[PDB]
CSV table of C-alpha atoms and ligand atoms in Angstrom, one decimal:
chain,number,residue,atom,x,y,z
A,1,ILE,CA,-3.5,-6.3,10.7
A,2,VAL,CA,-4.7,-8.2,13.7
A,3,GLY,CA,-1.4,-8.8,15.9
A,4,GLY,CA,1.9,-8.6,14.3
A,5,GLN,CA,4.5,-5.7,14.5
A,6,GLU,CA,4.7,-2.1,13.6
A,7,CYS,CA,6.8,-0.9,10.7
A,8,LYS,CA,9.8,0.8,11.8
A,9,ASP,CA,11.8,3.4,10.0
A,10,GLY,CA,12.2,2.4,6.2
A,11,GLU,CA,11.0,-1.2,7.0
A,12,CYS,CA,7.9,-1.1,4.6
A,13,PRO,CA,8.8,1.5,2.0
A,14,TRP,CA,6.6,0.0,-0.9
A,15,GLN,CA,3.4,0.7,1.1
A,16,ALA,CA,0.7,3.0,-0.2
A,17,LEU,CA,-2.6,4.0,1.5
A,18,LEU,CA,-5.8,4.6,-0.6
A,19,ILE,CA,-7.6,7.7,1.2
A,20,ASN,CA,-10.9,8.8,0.3
A,21,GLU,CA,-12.2,12.5,0.2
A,22,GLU,CA,-12.6,12.5,4.1
A,23,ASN,CA,-8.8,12.1,4.1
A,24,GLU,CA,-9.2,8.6,5.7
A,25,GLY,CA,-7.4,5.3,4.5
A,26,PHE,CA,-9.6,2.9,3.3
A,27,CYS,CA,-7.3,0.5,1.3
A,28,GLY,CA,-3.6,-0.4,0.9
A,29,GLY,CA,-1.6,-0.4,-2.3
A,30,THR,CA,2.1,-1.3,-3.4
A,31,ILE,CA,4.6,0.9,-5.1
A,32,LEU,CA,5.9,-0.8,-8.4
A,33,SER,CA,7.6,2.5,-9.6
A,34,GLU,CA,7.6,6.2,-9.4
A,35,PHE,CA,4.1,6.4,-11.6
A,36,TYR,CA,2.4,3.2,-10.7
A,37,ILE,CA,0.5,1.7,-7.7
A,38,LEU,CA,-0.6,-1.9,-7.6
A,39,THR,CA,-4.1,-2.4,-5.6
A,40,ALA,CA,-7.1,-4.9,-5.2
A,41,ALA,CA,-10.0,-4.1,-8.0
A,42,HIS,CA,-12.7,-4.1,-5.2
A,43,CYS,CA,-11.2,-1.2,-3.3
A,44,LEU,CA,-12.2,1.2,-6.2
A,45,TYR,CA,-15.9,0.5,-4.9
A,46,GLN,CA,-15.0,1.6,-1.3
A,47,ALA,CA,-14.5,5.2,-2.3
A,48,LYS,CA,-16.1,7.7,-5.1
A,49,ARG,CA,-12.8,9.8,-5.6
A,50,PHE,CA,-9.5,8.9,-3.9
A,51,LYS,CA,-6.0,9.8,-3.6
A,52,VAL,CA,-2.7,7.9,-2.8
A,53,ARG,CA,-0.6,8.5,0.1
A,54,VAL,CA,3.0,7.4,0.5
A,55,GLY,CA,5.9,7.6,3.1
A,56,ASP,CA,3.2,7.5,5.9
A,57,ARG,CA,3.6,5.3,8.8
A,58,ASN,CA,1.4,7.2,11.4
A,59,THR,CA,-1.7,8.9,10.1
A,60,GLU,CA,-2.4,11.4,13.0
A,61,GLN,CA,1.2,12.8,12.8
A,62,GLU,CA,2.8,14.4,9.5
A,63,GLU,CA,6.0,12.7,8.5
A,64,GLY,CA,7.6,15.4,6.4
A,65,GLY,CA,8.7,12.7,4.1
A,66,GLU,CA,5.0,11.9,3.4
A,67,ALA,CA,3.3,12.8,0.2
A,68,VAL,CA,-0.1,12.8,-1.5
A,69,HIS,CA,-0.6,11.7,-5.2
A,70,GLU,CA,-3.4,11.9,-7.4
A,71,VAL,CA,-4.5,9.2,-9.8
A,72,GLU,CA,-4.5,10.0,-13.7
A,73,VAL,CA,-5.5,6.5,-15.0
A,74,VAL,CA,-7.4,3.6,-13.0
A,75,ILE,CA,-6.5,0.4,-14.9
A,76,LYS,CA,-9.0,-2.3,-13.7
A,77,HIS,CA,-9.1,-5.8,-14.6
A,78,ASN,CA,-12.7,-6.4,-16.6
A,79,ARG,CA,-12.9,-10.0,-15.4
A,80,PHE,CA,-13.6,-8.9,-11.9
A,81,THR,CA,-16.8,-9.5,-10.0
A,82,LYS,CA,-18.1,-9.4,-6.4
A,83,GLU,CA,-19.7,-12.7,-6.7
A,84,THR,CA,-16.5,-14.7,-7.4
A,85,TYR,CA,-13.8,-12.2,-6.0
A,86,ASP,CA,-11.6,-13.3,-9.0
A,87,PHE,CA,-9.0,-11.2,-10.9
A,88,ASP,CA,-8.9,-8.7,-7.7
A,89,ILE,CA,-6.1,-6.5,-9.1
A,90,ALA,CA,-5.9,-3.1,-10.4
A,91,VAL,CA,-3.1,-0.7,-11.5
A,92,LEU,CA,-3.1,3.0,-10.7
A,93,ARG,CA,-1.0,5.5,-12.8
A,94,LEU,CA,-0.4,8.7,-11.0
A,95,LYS,CA,-0.5,12.2,-12.2
A,96,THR,CA,2.9,13.1,-10.4
A,97,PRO,CA,5.8,10.6,-10.0
A,98,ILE,CA,6.7,9.5,-6.4
A,99,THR,CA,10.1,10.9,-4.7
A,100,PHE,CA,11.9,7.9,-3.5
A,101,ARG,CA,13.6,8.3,0.0
A,102,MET,CA,13.5,6.8,3.3
A,103,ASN,CA,9.9,5.0,3.7
A,104,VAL,CA,9.5,5.6,-0.1
A,105,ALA,CA,10.8,3.1,-2.5
A,106,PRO,CA,9.2,0.5,-5.0
A,107,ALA,CA,8.8,-3.3,-4.4
A,108,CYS,CA,10.5,-5.5,-7.1
A,109,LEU,CA,8.3,-7.2,-9.8
A,110,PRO,CA,9.7,-10.7,-10.0
A,111,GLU,CA,9.7,-12.9,-13.4
A,112,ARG,CA,6.8,-15.6,-13.7
A,113,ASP,CA,8.5,-19.0,-13.4
A,114,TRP,CA,11.2,-17.7,-10.8
A,115,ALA,CA,8.6,-16.2,-8.6
A,116,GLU,CA,6.7,-19.5,-8.6
A,117,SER,CA,9.7,-21.9,-8.1
A,118,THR,CA,11.8,-19.6,-5.8
A,119,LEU,CA,9.5,-17.2,-3.8
A,120,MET,CA,6.1,-19.0,-3.5
A,121,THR,CA,8.1,-21.9,-2.3
A,122,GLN,CA,10.0,-19.9,0.9
A,123,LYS,CA,8.1,-20.7,4.1
A,124,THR,CA,6.8,-17.0,4.7
A,125,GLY,CA,5.9,-13.7,3.1
A,126,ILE,CA,5.1,-10.3,4.8
A,127,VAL,CA,1.7,-8.7,4.7
A,128,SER,CA,1.5,-5.0,5.9
A,129,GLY,CA,-1.2,-2.4,6.3
A,130,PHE,CA,-3.2,0.4,8.1
A,131,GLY,CA,-6.3,-2.0,8.4
A,132,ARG,CA,-8.2,-3.1,11.6
A,133,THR,CA,-6.4,-4.3,14.7
A,134,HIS,CA,-9.4,-6.6,15.6
A,135,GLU,CA,-12.0,-8.1,13.4
A,136,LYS,CA,-14.4,-5.6,15.1
A,137,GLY,CA,-12.6,-2.3,15.3
A,138,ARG,CA,-11.7,1.0,13.3
A,139,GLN,CA,-8.9,1.5,10.8
A,140,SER,CA,-5.3,1.5,12.5
A,141,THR,CA,-3.4,4.9,12.6
A,142,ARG,CA,-0.2,3.0,12.8
A,143,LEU,CA,1.2,1.0,9.7
A,144,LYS,CA,1.8,-2.8,10.8
A,145,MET,CA,3.4,-5.9,9.3
A,146,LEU,CA,3.0,-9.5,9.8
A,147,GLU,CA,5.2,-12.5,8.7
A,148,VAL,CA,2.7,-15.2,7.2
A,149,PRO,CA,3.4,-18.7,6.4
A,150,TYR,CA,2.8,-19.7,2.7
A,151,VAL,CA,-0.3,-22.0,3.1
A,152,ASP,CA,-0.7,-25.5,1.1
A,153,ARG,CA,-3.0,-25.1,-1.9
A,154,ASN,CA,-5.5,-27.9,-1.2
A,155,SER,CA,-5.4,-27.2,2.6
A,156,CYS,CA,-6.5,-23.6,1.5
A,157,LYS,CA,-9.3,-24.9,-0.6
A,158,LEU,CA,-10.5,-26.9,2.4
A,159,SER,CA,-10.6,-24.1,4.9
A,160,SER,CA,-12.6,-21.8,2.6
A,161,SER,CA,-16.5,-21.8,2.3
A,162,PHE,CA,-15.8,-20.2,-1.0
A,163,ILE,CA,-14.1,-20.9,-4.2
A,164,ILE,CA,-10.1,-20.4,-4.2
A,165,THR,CA,-9.4,-19.9,-7.9
A,166,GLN,CA,-5.9,-20.1,-9.5
A,167,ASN,CA,-5.6,-16.3,-9.3
A,168,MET,CA,-5.9,-16.6,-5.4
A,169,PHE,CA,-3.5,-18.0,-2.7
A,170,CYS,CA,-3.5,-18.6,1.1
A,171,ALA,CA,-1.2,-17.4,3.6
A,172,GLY,CA,-1.6,-17.3,7.4
A,173,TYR,CA,-2.1,-19.2,10.8
A,174,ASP,CA,-4.4,-22.3,11.4
A,175,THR,CA,-4.5,-21.4,15.3
A,176,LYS,CA,-2.3,-18.3,15.9
A,177,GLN,CA,-4.8,-15.3,16.0
A,178,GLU,CA,-2.8,-12.8,13.9
A,179,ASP,CA,-3.8,-12.2,10.1
A,180,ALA,CA,-4.5,-9.2,7.9
A,181,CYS,CA,-8.2,-7.6,8.1
A,182,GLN,CA,-10.5,-5.1,6.8
A,183,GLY,CA,-8.7,-1.9,5.2
A,184,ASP,CA,-5.4,-4.0,4.5
A,185,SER,CA,-7.0,-4.9,1.2
A,186,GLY,CA,-5.0,-3.9,-2.0
A,187,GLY,CA,-1.7,-3.9,0.3
A,188,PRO,CA,1.5,-5.7,-0.3
A,189,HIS,CA,2.3,-9.2,0.3
A,190,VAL,CA,6.1,-9.4,-0.4
A,191,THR,CA,8.6,-12.4,-0.1
A,192,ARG,CA,12.3,-11.8,0.7
A,193,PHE,CA,14.9,-13.5,-1.5
A,194,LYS,CA,18.5,-12.8,-0.5
A,195,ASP,CA,17.6,-9.5,1.3
A,196,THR,CA,15.6,-8.2,-1.6
A,197,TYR,CA,11.6,-7.8,-1.5
A,198,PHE,CA,9.5,-9.0,-4.3
A,199,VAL,CA,5.9,-8.2,-4.9
A,200,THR,CA,4.0,-11.6,-4.5
A,201,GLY,CA,0.5,-10.9,-3.4
A,202,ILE,CA,-2.5,-8.2,-3.2
A,203,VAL,CA,-4.5,-8.6,0.1
A,204,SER,CA,-7.9,-9.9,-1.5
A,205,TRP,CA,-10.2,-11.3,1.3
A,206,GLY,CA,-10.9,-13.6,4.2
A,207,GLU,CA,-13.7,-14.8,6.5
A,208,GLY,CA,-13.4,-12.3,9.3
A,209,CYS,CA,-9.9,-11.6,10.7
A,210,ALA,CA,-7.4,-14.2,12.5
A,211,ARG,CA,-10.1,-16.6,12.6
A,212,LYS,CA,-8.8,-20.0,13.7
A,213,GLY,CA,-8.8,-22.6,10.8
A,214,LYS,CA,-9.0,-19.8,8.1
A,215,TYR,CA,-6.8,-17.8,6.2
A,216,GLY,CA,-5.7,-14.5,4.5
A,217,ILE,CA,-6.5,-14.8,0.7
A,218,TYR,CA,-4.5,-12.9,-1.8
A,219,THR,CA,-4.2,-12.1,-5.5
A,220,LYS,CA,-1.4,-14.1,-7.0
A,221,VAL,CA,0.8,-11.3,-8.6
A,222,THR,CA,2.6,-14.0,-11.0
A,223,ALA,CA,-0.8,-14.8,-12.5
A,224,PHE,CA,-0.7,-11.0,-13.8
A,225,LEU,CA,2.7,-9.9,-14.7
A,226,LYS,CA,2.1,-9.5,-18.5
A,227,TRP,CA,-1.3,-7.6,-17.7
A,228,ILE,CA,1.0,-5.4,-15.0
A,229,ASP,CA,3.7,-4.9,-17.7
A,230,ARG,CA,1.1,-3.8,-20.4
A,231,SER,CA,-0.7,-1.7,-17.8
A,232,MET,CA,2.7,0.4,-17.2
A,233,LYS,CA,3.0,0.8,-21.0
A,234,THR,CA,-0.4,2.7,-20.9
B,1,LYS,CA,21.0,-29.2,-10.2
B,2,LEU,CA,21.5,-25.7,-11.9
B,3,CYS,CA,18.9,-22.9,-10.8
B,4,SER,CA,17.6,-25.6,-8.1
B,5,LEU,CA,20.7,-25.7,-6.4
B,6,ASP,CA,20.8,-22.5,-4.3
B,7,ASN,CA,19.3,-20.4,-7.2
B,8,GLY,CA,22.4,-21.1,-9.4
B,9,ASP,CA,24.2,-18.5,-7.3
B,10,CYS,CA,22.3,-15.7,-8.8
B,11,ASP,CA,21.4,-12.7,-6.9
B,12,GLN,CA,17.9,-12.7,-8.2
B,13,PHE,CA,16.5,-14.4,-11.4
B,14,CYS,CA,17.8,-17.9,-12.6
B,15,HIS,CA,17.1,-19.7,-15.8
B,16,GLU,CA,18.4,-22.4,-17.5
B,17,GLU,CA,19.5,-22.0,-21.3
B,18,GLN,CA,21.5,-24.8,-23.1
B,19,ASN,CA,21.8,-27.0,-19.8
B,20,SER,CA,23.6,-24.0,-17.9
B,21,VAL,CA,22.4,-21.3,-15.5
B,22,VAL,CA,21.7,-17.8,-16.7
B,23,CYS,CA,21.1,-15.1,-14.1
B,24,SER,CA,19.2,-11.7,-14.6
B,25,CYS,CA,18.0,-8.6,-12.5
B,26,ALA,CA,14.8,-6.7,-11.8
B,27,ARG,CA,14.4,-3.4,-13.4
B,28,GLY,CA,16.9,-0.8,-11.8
B,29,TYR,CA,19.9,-3.2,-11.5
B,30,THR,CA,22.6,-4.4,-13.9
B,31,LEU,CA,24.1,-7.7,-14.0
B,32,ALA,CA,27.6,-7.9,-12.5
B,33,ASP,CA,30.8,-9.1,-14.7
B,34,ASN,CA,30.5,-12.5,-12.7
B,35,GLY,CA,27.0,-12.7,-14.5
B,36,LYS,CA,25.5,-13.4,-10.8
B,37,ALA,CA,25.2,-10.4,-8.6
B,38,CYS,CA,22.6,-7.6,-9.4
B,39,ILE,CA,24.2,-3.8,-9.1
B,40,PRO,CA,21.7,-1.1,-8.3
B,41,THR,CA,22.0,1.6,-11.1
B,42,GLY,CA,20.8,4.3,-8.8
B,43,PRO,CA,19.6,5.2,-5.4
B,44,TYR,CA,16.5,3.6,-3.8
B,45,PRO,CA,16.4,0.3,-6.2
B,46,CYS,CA,13.4,-1.8,-5.8
B,47,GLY,CA,12.9,-4.2,-2.9
B,48,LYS,CA,15.4,-2.7,-0.6
B,49,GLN,CA,14.6,-1.3,2.8
B,50,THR,CA,15.5,2.3,3.4
B,51,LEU,CA,17.2,1.5,6.6
B,52,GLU,CA,20.3,3.9,6.3
C,1,LGL,O1,-12.9,-10.2,3.3
C,1,LGL,C1,-13.8,-10.1,3.9
C,1,LGL,C2,-13.6,-9.3,5.2
C,1,LGL,C3,-14.6,-9.2,6.2
C,1,LGL,C4,-14.1,-8.5,7.0
C,1,LGL,C5,-14.5,-8.1,8.5
C,1,LGL,F1,-15.0,-9.2,9.3
C,1,LGL,F2,-13.8,-7.2,9.2
C,1,LGL,F3,-15.6,-7.2,8.4
C,1,LGL,N1,-12.8,-8.2,7.0
C,1,LGL,N2,-12.5,-8.8,5.8
C,1,LGL,C6,-11.3,-8.8,5.2
C,1,LGL,C7,-10.9,-8.0,4.1
C,1,LGL,C8,-9.7,-8.0,3.5
C,1,LGL,C9,-8.7,-8.9,4.2
C,1,LGL,C10,-9.2,-9.9,5.2
C,1,LGL,C11,-8.3,-10.8,6.0
C,1,LGL,N3,-7.0,-11.1,5.4
C,1,LGL,N4,-6.7,-12.1,6.3
C,1,LGL,C12,-7.8,-12.5,7.2
C,1,LGL,O2,-7.9,-13.3,8.3
C,1,LGL,N5,-8.8,-11.6,6.8
C,1,LGL,C13,-10.5,-9.7,5.6
C,1,LGL,C14,-16.1,-9.7,5.9
C,1,LGL,C15,-16.0,-10.7,4.8
C,1,LGL,N6,-15.1,-10.7,3.5
C,1,LGL,C16,-15.2,-11.3,2.4
C,1,LGL,C17,-15.6,-12.7,2.5
C,1,LGL,C18,-15.8,-13.4,1.2
C,1,LGL,C19,-15.5,-12.7,0.1
C,1,LGL,C20,-15.8,-13.4,-1.2
C,1,LGL,C21,-14.9,-14.8,-1.4
C,1,LGL,C22,-15.1,-15.5,-2.7
C,1,LGL,C23,-16.1,-15.2,-3.4
C,1,LGL,C24,-16.9,-14.1,-3.3
C,1,LGL,C25,-16.7,-13.3,-1.9
C,1,LGL,C26,-17.8,-12.1,-1.9
C,1,LGL,N7,-19.1,-12.5,-1.4
C,1,LGL,C27,-19.3,-13.1,-0.1
C,1,LGL,C28,-20.6,-13.2,0.3
C,1,LGL,C29,-21.4,-12.1,-0.6
C,1,LGL,C30,-20.0,-11.5,-1.4
C,1,LGL,C31,-15.3,-11.2,-0.1
C,1,LGL,C32,-15.1,-10.6,1.2
C,2,NA,NA1,1.6,10.5,8.8
C,3,NA,NA1,-6.1,-17.9,10.7
C-alpha cells in the first residue's frame, strides 16, 4: 500500500500473506473460513511452491499468534489469462484449519444482490496489504490499510488504457497519492456495513501505484459467489 | 420502500418476499427473534474486528 495507515491490533484479522520458499511475502489473501483462503489467480505464477501466513502484522518480528499453513488444494479459475487479467480469482484449501484469535478471523461473504445494492453503493471500502510502499521499492514489513472511494464504472473505464471487464471494479483517488501496489495482489477489499466487514474485492492490478488519474482494479467478488461456494464444497 | 429504506432494519441481508422485508445472516450468525438482528453462534464470527 502507498500511503494509508498501519493495521493496529485486531483491525485487519482476515488478512493472509502468501509466502514463497525463501519465506518472503509476495501476495495477499482473505480468510473466508478456517480452511479457505481467497486470492488472485495471477499470484499463483509469482512462486513455484508457497505457504499461507496468518495473524502476521510485522514480518521481521514473530507475533506468537502468527501461524503458517500449507496448501492442500489450489482451485484456480480456468477462464484466467495474462492477456485480459479477467477472472483474477483463486481459492486455496488448507491442509490444517486456522485458529481464530485476535488478528485471526474470517471476512464475511455477502449474498449477491445485497452486496451489489448495499455494499458496492457505500462511499468507500478498505484495501490492505504487505505490498510496496512506493511504486519503486521493496515489499513492506508492516501490514497497512487504506480507505478507498468506490469509483464510478464508466469513469473507471475512461482512466484505463486496458479493458475493464464486468468481473473487475475501480476504487481509489484521482489526485490523492495513496493506493495499493505490487505485492498487495490477492489481498482483501472489504466494505463495512453496520460494524460487520464483508469481502468485496481481490486486489487485481493497476498502472503503477497511486498514479494521478488512475485507480486500483479489483476482482468483483459478487461475480463469483457460486463458484466460491462450490470451491468450499471441494 | 422496504429494503431500500435503511436496509429494512436488517443487521445484514435484506430481501423482499410477498411485498415485505425478509432478513438473513452470513454463516456463523443466527437470526434473532425480532427477525432483524444477527447473533454470532460462536467466538470470532466473520467480519468482526478482534479489538477485545
Ligand atoms: O498491476 C500492475 C502493477 C505494476 C506495478 C509496479 F509498478 F509496481 F511494477 N504494480 N502493479 C500493481 C499490482 C497490484 C496492484 C496495483 C495497484 N493497485 N492500485 C494501484 O494504484 N496499483 C498495482 C506494473 C503493471 N501492472 C499491470 C498492469 C496491467 C495489467 C493488465 C490489465 C488488463 C489486461 C491485461 C493486463 C496485463 N498485460 C499488461 C501488459 C502486458 C500484460 C496487469 C498488470
Ligand atoms: Na510477524
Ligand atoms: Na490514483
